[PDB]
Amino acid sequence: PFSVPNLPLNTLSNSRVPSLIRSMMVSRDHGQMVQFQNGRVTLDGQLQGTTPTSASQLCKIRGSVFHANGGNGYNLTELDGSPYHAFESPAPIGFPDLGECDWHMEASPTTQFDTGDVIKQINVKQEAAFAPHLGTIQADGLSDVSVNTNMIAKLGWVSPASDGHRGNVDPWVIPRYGSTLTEAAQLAPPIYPPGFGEAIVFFMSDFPIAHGANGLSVPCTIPQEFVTHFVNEQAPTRGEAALLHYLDPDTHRNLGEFKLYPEGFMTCVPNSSGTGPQTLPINGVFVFVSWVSRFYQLKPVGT
Amino acid sequence: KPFSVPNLPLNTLSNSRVPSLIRSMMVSRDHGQMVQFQNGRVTLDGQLQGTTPTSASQLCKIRGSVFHANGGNGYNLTELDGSPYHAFESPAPIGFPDLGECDWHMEASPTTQFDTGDVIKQINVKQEAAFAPHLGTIQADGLSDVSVNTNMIAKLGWVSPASDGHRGNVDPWVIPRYGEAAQLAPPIYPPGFGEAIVFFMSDFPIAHGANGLSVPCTIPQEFVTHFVNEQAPTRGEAALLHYLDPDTHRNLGEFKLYPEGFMTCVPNSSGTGPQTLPINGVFVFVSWVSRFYQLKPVGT
């Protein structure tokens, strides 16, 4: 039988950055379409895009240092050291999907070391030599690292694109992973609001962002622990949408009804002009009620 | 309601002490006699213990407000969500690192929106006299130019030998002195019957590590989350598990998972036990067994 985790939201992780869920929101300016590559899963537990099983794989890069044509970077592998297969995903599993910004990362050797001198503060820019789908990304801070040094890079913070094309970091934008004719076809597909007054629910987490469009806020379509739960359970999808209640376990009140679609995103009907689920407490738990049709009309949520 | 473990291959799961993928399983002659890790601590019926979080995203992070005191700067600690740290809950805030006797090199950033990376600080947390997480205070180098009462989240980057020189290596089997401290997860012992504790090993950036980059934990983080989610009553002295081969789906070895959240096997004479098993296998619950249930040896 289908289920969602019986765990309070505020103890769960964002599925795009390894940070606790701070709030829920709907978006008028950004909620018309998203194509996040992390936090992408079916309700029957098929991982999509670059989505990992574990939050510990999120926003990490692994590869071997190259020096070519006056530029330094990584020949990418998977985080476990196994080869990156370009037909399988648009980048290695857990590769960050924060588009059009600088990635300030800490890179360390994948072999035992004696001193912190082998630890490098690197900057990954999304410019001409950013080609994760082809298995190569440029990086500043690698000039003094020997060719073929195997390393793991962990995302610390992001800042506006070094080239000046965007004055802020927009956490709604995904990377351009490659430049081929069939490039958009290799991605986890776009997510649209489905109709019937429904808006996509975004789970917001704080991440270290210099000059963020929404300050520290990063949106995702499902908590990481929900991803893991679906992969674990492999529950057959038996309807067009899973009706959920958001319960307050402390007050024993039903706070709102929600719809979770086979494509792994959640909707609510925001009350009139409204912030919808943004005013709800963040320590509630989702519970599966039943399978419903796509046209099942939800009770409005919020003020 | 019925007891289960995740149907997830080990190599996709996280260490419960450091946010890194599981690389191997092992037993330990030198360190397997007693461990008291404070992270990765959970009952099979889903009670979190020590500083153990629900989410891997909470692991090895500290949150607090900068204070400046004569010759020493540090954090007044809170929980990672900004809510107050209660000593009646845990021996330190949830997700507090449990790598004892070593320097913590951490990246600290403001919890309020900022414009540039000049507010990002590289800090060093030493485990000396002013390291008092149970009292809700730690000292840190690298905070002299941060305004008092700046709220910050610090994330563990790497660890190195203690600044005071009392140890030449980082020993990942040693926990901090938190205090005495209320809510220390209790010691774990091998229970007899030829059984050795199974450690799930992950690499973390460690300068001069006793075992290089390798950090042991007693259970994968996703197992912790699964037990908290399921809240299955414990109906026996131990849960018999099979470790299944990924290609044949067949039994490679039997394990006992105890109510206290740790797992054991009987290593073959040779002695590497589960270390030679493939790391992309899955554990499956078989049945509840008695404490004296004698396991078939595992390994070469």
Author numbering:
A (entry chain A): 231 to 533
B (entry chain B): 230 to 408, 413 to 533
Sentences from the study reporting this entry:
NoV VP1 can be divided into two major domains: the N-terminal shell (S) domain and the C-terminal protruding (P) domain. The P domains form the outermost, dimeric protrusions of NoV virions, which plays critical roles in receptor recognition and host immune responses. HuNoVs recognize human histo-blood group antigens (HBGAs) as host receptors or attachment factors that play an important role in huNoV host susceptibility. In this study, we provided both phenotypic and structural evidence to show that huNoV DSV and VA115 recognize a group of glycans with terminal galactoses as ligands.
